Amino acid sequence: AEVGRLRYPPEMPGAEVKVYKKVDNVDLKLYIYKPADWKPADRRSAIVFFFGGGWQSGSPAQFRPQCEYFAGRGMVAMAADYRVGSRHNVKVADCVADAKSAIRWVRQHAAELGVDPQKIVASGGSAGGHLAACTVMVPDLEAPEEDHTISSQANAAILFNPVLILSREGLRQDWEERLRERLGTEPKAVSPYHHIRAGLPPMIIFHGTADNTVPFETIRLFAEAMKKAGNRCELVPFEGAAHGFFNFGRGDNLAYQKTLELADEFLVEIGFLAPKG
């Protein structure tokens, strides 16, 4: 409910604003939080958050608290706007292009951001978690006006109850034709589950076991298949928790603090953050 009441466009107090993409006459912005000791020639890890909202609505404000946390830990932390259905009359494949554009932009501009271009983390909640997952493992579906010599692939992912299975193949023609028109492409082309293979970037996933929007079982299957392929895919179930459980301002912030603690340790584990101390 509280995520639902967030402002668009957000204020994002303390963020620097950068336009990463111009498309359909809209400027898509990154809201960039730097650590207090940031200096130009730093080579920090970065994290880019994608808000949730069913590819229909939402706001970068959702992930403001997370950005401030990760900035305080030494990362360049940012929340990306991306086109959605209610504002821009786009479909999911467009959202995926925008997410990929954001990662590509951060990598392209890593030097001036004070960022290591091979320590860029994608993150998001629900539909934004799907987008993050697409930046790590789904091939680019389009070549927008951007630097095609720079990869769009994130180096790690941190997902908060993501959608990861968008096709029914390998689990009814009309439903896949239905999905094709909703998604703007063949459903498998924006289905992370359908692109599981060896040699993918590491990730951590936080998911409630009582999630009635994205069933936990889809995430368990994803994670099990990822481990079978030799990938580091850490799945943290939150027993009895519902969709959106991880958000700032939810359930006395307990699950908010817990997800951040475990996300932080994962980033230490993969060498993206120094140990606390």
Q: Which long-range contacts (CB under 8 A, 24 or more apart) does 139-145 make?
A: 139/189, 139/195, 140/97, 140/100, 141/93, 141/96, 141/97, 141/185, 141/189, 141/190, 142/93, 142/97, 144/21, 144/23, 144/97, 144/101
Q: Is 243 in the site for Cl ion (CB under 5 A)?
A: yes
Q: How far apart are CA 221 and CA 233, in angstroms?
A: 11
149 versus 212: smaller Cβ distance to Cl ion: 212
Considering only residues 2 through 31, tell me which ones interact with Cl ion, judged by CB under 5 A: none
141 versus 242: smaller Cβ distance to Cl ion: 242
Q: How far apart are CA 48 and CA 77, in angstroms?
A: 6
Least distance CB 161 / Cl ion (angstroms): 8
Select the span of 57-65, 83-91, 176-184, 208-216 touching Cl ion (CB under 5 A).
Answer: 208-216
Spatial contact of 152 and 103, defined as CB atoms under 8 Å apart: yes
Residue 234 amino acid letter? E
Least distance CB 43 / Cl ion (angstroms): 40
For residue 149, count CB atoms less than 10 angstroms from its CB and return exposed for 0-12, middle for 13-18, buried for 19 or more: exposed
44 versus 207: smaller Cβ distance to Cl ion: 207
Select the span of 38-46, 148-156, 191-199, 242-250 touching Cl ion (CB under 5 A).
Answer: 242-250
Tell me which of 212, 239, 252, 276 binds Cl ion, using CB under 5 A.
Answer: 212
Considering only residues 32 through 71, tell me which ones interact with Cl ion, judged by CB under 5 A: none
79 versus 241: smaller Cβ distance to Cl ion: 241
254 versus 274: smaller Cβ distance to Cl ion: 254
Residue 229: both structure tokens together: 């392929």
Interacting residues toward Cl ion by CB under 5 A: 211-213, 242-243
